[PDB]
Amino acid sequence: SAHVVILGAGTGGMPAAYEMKEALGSGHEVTLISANDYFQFVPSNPWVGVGWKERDDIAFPIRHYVERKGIHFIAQSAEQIDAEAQNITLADGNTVHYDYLMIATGPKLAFENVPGSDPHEGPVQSICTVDHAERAFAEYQALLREPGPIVIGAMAGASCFGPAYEYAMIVASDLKKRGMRDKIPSFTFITSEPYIGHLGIQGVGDSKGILTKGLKEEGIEAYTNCKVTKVEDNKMYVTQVDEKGETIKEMVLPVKFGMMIPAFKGVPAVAGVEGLCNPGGFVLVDEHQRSKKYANIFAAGIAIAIPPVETTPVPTGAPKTGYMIESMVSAAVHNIKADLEGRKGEQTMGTWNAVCFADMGDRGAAFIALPQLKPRKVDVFAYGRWVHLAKVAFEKYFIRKMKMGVSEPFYEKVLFKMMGITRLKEE
Amino acid sequence: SAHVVILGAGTGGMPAAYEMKEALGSGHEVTLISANDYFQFVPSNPWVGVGWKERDDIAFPIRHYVERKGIHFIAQSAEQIDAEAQNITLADGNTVHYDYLMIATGPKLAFENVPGSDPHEGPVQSICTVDHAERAFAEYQALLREPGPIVIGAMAGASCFGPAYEYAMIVASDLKKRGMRDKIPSFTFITSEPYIGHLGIQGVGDSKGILTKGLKEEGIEAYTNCKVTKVEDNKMYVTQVDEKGETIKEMVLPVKFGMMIPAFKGVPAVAGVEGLCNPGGFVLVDEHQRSKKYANIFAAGIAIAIPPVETTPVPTGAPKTGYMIESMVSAAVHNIKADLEGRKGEQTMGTWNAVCFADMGDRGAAFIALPQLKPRKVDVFAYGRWVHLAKVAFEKYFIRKMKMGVSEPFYEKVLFKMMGITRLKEE
Numbered sequence: 062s063a064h065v066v067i068l069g070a071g072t073g074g075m076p077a078a079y080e081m082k083e084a085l086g087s088g089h090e091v092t093l094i095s096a097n098d099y100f101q102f103v104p105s106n107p108w109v110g111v112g113w114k115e116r117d118d119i120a121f122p123i124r125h126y127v128e129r130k131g132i133h134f135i136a137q138s139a140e141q142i143d144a145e146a147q148n149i150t151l152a153d154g155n156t157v158h159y160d161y162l163m164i165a166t167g168p169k170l171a172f173e174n175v176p177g178s179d180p181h182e183g184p185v186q187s188i189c190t191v192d193h194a195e196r197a198f199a200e201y202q203a204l205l206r207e208p209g210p211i212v213i214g215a216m217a218g219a220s221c222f223g224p225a226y227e228y229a230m231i232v233a234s235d236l237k238k239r240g241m242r243d244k245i246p247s248f249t250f251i252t253s254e255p256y257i258g259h260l261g262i263q264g265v266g267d268s269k270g271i272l273t274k275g276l277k278e279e280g281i282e283a284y285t286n287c288k289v290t291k292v293e294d295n296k297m298y299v300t301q302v303d304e305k306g307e308t309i310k311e312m313v314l315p316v317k318f319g320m321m322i323p324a325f326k327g328v329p330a331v332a333g334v335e336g337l338c339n340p341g342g343f344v345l346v347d348e349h350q351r352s353k354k355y356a357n358i359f360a361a362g363i364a365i366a367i368p369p370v371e372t373t374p375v376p377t378g379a380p381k382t383g384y385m386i387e388s389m390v391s392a393a394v395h396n397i398k399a400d401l402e403g404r405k406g407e408q409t410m411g412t413w414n415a416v417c418f419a420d421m422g423d424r425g426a427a428f429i430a431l432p433q434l435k436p437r438k439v440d441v442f443a444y445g446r447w448v449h450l451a452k453v454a455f456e457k458y459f460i461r462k463m464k465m466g467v468s469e470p471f472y473e474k475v476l477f478k479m480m481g482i483t484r485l486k487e488e
Numbered sequence: 489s490a491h492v493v494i495l496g497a498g499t500g501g502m503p504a505a506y507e508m509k510e511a512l513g514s515g516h517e518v519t520l521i522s523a524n525d526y527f528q529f530v531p532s533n534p535w536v537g538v539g540w541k542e543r544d545d546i547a548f549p550i551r552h553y554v555e556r557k558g559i560h561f562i563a564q565s566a567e568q569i570d571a572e573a574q575n576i577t578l579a580d581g582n583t584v585h586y587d588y589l590m591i592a593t594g595p596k597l598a599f600e601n602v603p604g605s606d607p608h609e610g611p612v613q614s615i616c617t618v619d620h621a622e623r624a625f626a627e628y629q630a631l632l633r634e635p636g637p638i639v640i641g642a643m644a645g646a647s648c649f650g651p652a653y654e655y656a657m658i659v660a661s662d663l664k665k666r667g668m669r670d671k672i673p674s675f676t677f678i679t680s681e682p683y684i685g686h687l688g689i690q691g692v693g694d695s696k697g698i699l700t701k702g703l704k705e706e707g708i709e710a711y712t713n714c715k716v717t718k719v720e721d722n723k724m725y726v727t728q729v730d731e732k733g734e735t736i737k738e739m740v741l742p743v744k745f746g747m748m749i750p751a752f753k754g755v756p757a758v759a760g761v762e763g764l765c766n767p768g769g770f771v772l773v774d775e776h777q778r779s780k781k782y783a784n785i786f787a788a789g790i791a792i793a794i795p796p797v798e799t800t801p802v803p804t805g806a807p808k809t810g811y812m813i814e815s816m817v818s819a820a821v822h823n824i825k826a827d828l829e830g831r832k833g834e835q836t837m838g839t840w841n842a843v844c845f846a847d848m849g850d851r852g853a854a855f856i857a858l859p860q861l862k863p864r865k866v867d868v869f870a871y872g873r874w875v876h877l878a879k880v881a882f883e884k885y886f887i888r889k890m891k892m893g894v895s896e897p898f899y900e901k902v903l904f905k906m907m908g909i910t911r912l913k914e915e
């Protein structure tokens with residue numbers, strides 16, 4: 062009886078392993094493979110990067126929780142995927158065989174697009190992982206000891222803009238709480254968006270007006286249509302273009318403390334599978350989450366390819382966010398099960414949507430947009446205290462579910478919990 | 489076995505009849521009694537009031553639809569409820585006996601609070617019912633023939649403010665479309681809210697700023713903290729107070745075309761039941777929608793009493809809106825079924841919330857607030873094109889459901905459809 066392997070224990074993969082096991086019962090092996098032995102709640106990383114949260118608030122060991130559900134856990138990184146032989150080679154030389162593979166490997170952080178931009182080779186840091194956010198906090202503490210120019214923003218090719226705004230705002234806010242704000246010579250915001258609050262999705266509600274007003278209020282100077290060409294000698298080299306791509310200026314910005322959201326690519330093990338991915342290394346799938354090249358490979362989350370519906374003067378991407386990811390997981394689990402029972406599963410991701418909550422302290426911004434191209438059925442950008450409460454409640458709930466286990470209908474619970482809630486709403 | 493009577497076939501009453509008959513089956517009699525033989529989708533009345541919709545777009549005969557579902561229908565108004573004898577005396581002198589009564593009679597429009605304000609006795613119209621909205625549109629057509637001052641707003645004691653803003657906005661808009669906007673000598677907005685966009689619920693998101701801007705953009709002059717003392721000789725007499733209730737001015741406004749949302753009271757048949765209601769005639773219920781005085785009378789919708797959580801310089805009320813209404817109905821249906829089965833029903837309404845969608849043409853404003861007292865868990869006010877699409881989709885849906893019939897899970901459908909949707913979102 063079919064062996065199902067889930068590659069990646071992240072926002073998509075962990076729930077996918079619980080859902081797959083639940084759906085398939087004790088008669089089928091379900092193996093979860095991940096590079097780390099812990100789960101981390103990614104959207105809390107910006108707060109870790111400013112010292113508002115600690116690693117152990119947002120991360121926990123996976124093994125016990127999945128094993129108690131009958132899932133076989135391997136805390137090892139996949140180095141190779143041989144799609145013909147249907148085996149995965151792990152870092153220690155072991156291999157895992159699968160009948161169905163679900164790829165949930167998320168993003169490769171493509172620092173190499175911008176020489177010197179890697180967190181280890183310069184002052185420009187990053188908050189996408191808890192390891193890097195801890196490193197960002199450390200460098201932030203160094204800034205506090207020897208104040209200098211701050212640069213925060215998002216690279217060309219980035220697709221996750223929200224956390225750049227969140228980070229800039231919470232850094233400014235923390236500086237003030239520390240009485241250290243006026244010691245900063247300059248505080249610049251650099252983005253590849255064609256305008257503030259474009260967010261990779263051509264704006265949502267009054268995102269432009271509200272985000273613009275936030276940066277202005279914090280004394281942050283913002284530049285759009287920018288690409289960083291390199292980071293060298295504690296200086297960021299920026300090229301800025303007009304709407305038509307022609308460059309209209311170059312800047313050289315000194316940097317004592319920096320944080321740019323990198324562009325995302327597919328991870329190497331996945332990108333290295335012949336015909337599986339596009340040039341960026343994202344898995345080409347159909348509406349059923351099935352690989353177009355391999356009938357027994359499915360994929361969910363950031364790892365999948367989603368074609369642009371629009372283009373920008375500086376390359377930007379559209380974000381892949383939680384609700385939609387869980388929705389992909391659900392479809393993949395359903396369609397794999399069907400495929401086991403010798404049928405073709407027809408479940409889909411559903412309508413493209415983006416949902417993001419940014420907490421700036423006691424208030425935040427949240428948006429929902431769908432579908433991708435306008436005119437939209439929902440296009441809301443909201444600022445207020447309630448967003449802080451929602452964000453906190455959802456992190457609490459999601460971490461709790463990752464420990465207790467999850468089932469098929471999870472993704473729908475994910476929808477009404479991000480707001481807050483069906484729990485508070487009284488069922 | 490027990491005969492169940494639903495009194496009133498509106499937003500709460502119709503669903504409640506379908507749900508009650510489905511829940512009880514063929515063994516129990518379910519009777520629906522309503523003043524009118526037709527259903528009308530109330531939120532569309534303001535559009536009828538400006539001629540953007542016709543009666544037959546938003547209303548339809550009830551009889552065939554509920555009978556085909558096993559429900560007895562009586563197109564008659566209840567004149568009296570005798571709660572000791574458990575019968576209802578109708579306009580024609582017939583009586584209906586019940587074992588359980590569910591009261592869904594909505595609002596009495598309390599025009600008598602303001603002498604001269606009744607739509608039949610003056611130029612100040614109203615748009616809460618489709619009859620009155622039609623009469624409003626007629627008066628608006630008279631305005632077009634002989635331009636004069638416009639006054640739109642909400643009386644003291646009102647609880648439904650959104651439609652006053654909508655109507656002001658759509659009248660201004662239709663005026664422009666007809667190239668008649670500049671023939672209007674003045675266009676004034678008068679409200680008992682302490683500030684623009686208080687909406688009876690202490691503001692939601694940036695309701696204040698957004699609505700204020702809307703009135704300003706339409707050349708509409710707004711006054712808050714107002715009460716209308718009387719309407720006489722085509723003049724509205726207004727008293728305005730300060731935060732402490734001291735009057736700081738009186739105005740006399742000539743009115744050629746007017747529309748003020750009246751305060752709501754409990755209907756006379758219900759209010760006249762000794763010990764059933766508060767002084768406003770709203771039914772005193774517990775958290776199970778059951779009357780506090782009569783264990784066999786339940787209530788849902790506007791007809792129930794909800795204590796204020798705050799007070800305002802001019803009396804105002806908090807709105808009772810669709811989603812919360814459907815929650816009340818469901819709990820009532822469930823708890824009645826329970827009673828018939830020797831159990832105490834424990835289902836509740838849930839968390840207080842308000843949800844409103846105002847369509848101004850190709851764009852609109854919607855808000856969600858919960859719970860009633862701040863700090864809120866959700867506090868969103870959104871403006872945009874998607875609001876129009878959502879409004880249209882939900883009306884189309886609600887009307888179709890009232891024709892097809894409905895079941896218990898309806899109220900969670902009302903939630904995801906008021907937005908748009910689970911249908912678009914794809915299941």
Ligand SMILES: Cc1cc2nc3c(=O)[nH]c(=O)nc-3n(C[C@H](O)[C@H](O)[C@H](O)COP(=O)(O)OP(=O)(O)OC[C@H]3O[C@@H](n4cnc5c(N)ncnc54)[C@H](O)[C@@H]3O)c2cc1C
Pocket residue numbers: 068069070071072073074094095096097103104105106107137138139140165166167168188189190221224328330361362363364381382383384386416417418419
């Ligand atoms: C800073 C930040 C803030 C965000 N905030 C929000 C938000 O507020 N709301 C929202 O809906 N979304 C948010 N997102 C977007 C999104 O939901 C996350 O990026 C999310 O974690 C993506 O889910 P995923 O399962 O696709 O990838 P991940 O969660 O990154 O998981 C991928 C996993 O696969 C593993 N892996 C990779 N390669 C291998 C290999 N070769 N072998 C074995 N394992 C491997 C990883 O180590 C990892 O555990 C945010 C993203 C970032 C970076």
Ligand SMILES: Cc1cc2nc3c(=O)[nH]c(=O)nc-3n(C[C@H](O)[C@H](O)[C@H](O)COP(=O)(O)OP(=O)(O)OC[C@H]3O[C@@H](n4cnc5c(N)ncnc54)[C@H](O)[C@@H]3O)c2cc1C
Pocket residue numbers: 495496497498499500501521522523524530531532533534564565566567592593594595615616617648651755756757758788789790791808809810811813843844845846
């Ligand atoms: C102009 C306007 C716009 C609104 N827009 C929204 C919106 O966009 N979103 C939202 O969630 N809510 C909206 N509402 C608020 C609300 O949801 C409605 O008022 C809704 O119709 C109330 O539900 P109900 O069943 O309690 O009362 P109703 O829908 O008014 O039903 C009451 C019914 O009982 C009947 N009746 C009354 N007396 C008797 C009697 N003595 N005997 C027999 N039958 C009787 C009536 O004729 C009627 O059919 C709006 C309200 C108004 C007035």
Ligand SMILES: [S]
Pocket residue numbers: 170187188189190193194
């Ligand atoms: S990162």
Ligand SMILES: [S]
Pocket residue numbers: 220221222223224260380417
């Ligand atoms: S984002």
Ligand SMILES: [S]
Pocket residue numbers: 223224227417418419420
């Ligand atoms: S974010």
Ligand SMILES: [S]
Pocket residue numbers: 597614615616617620621
């Ligand atoms: S009305």
Ligand SMILES: [S]
Pocket residue numbers: 647648649650651687807844
């Ligand atoms: S409202």
Ligand SMILES: [S]
Pocket residue numbers: 650651654844845846847
């Ligand atoms: S409304």
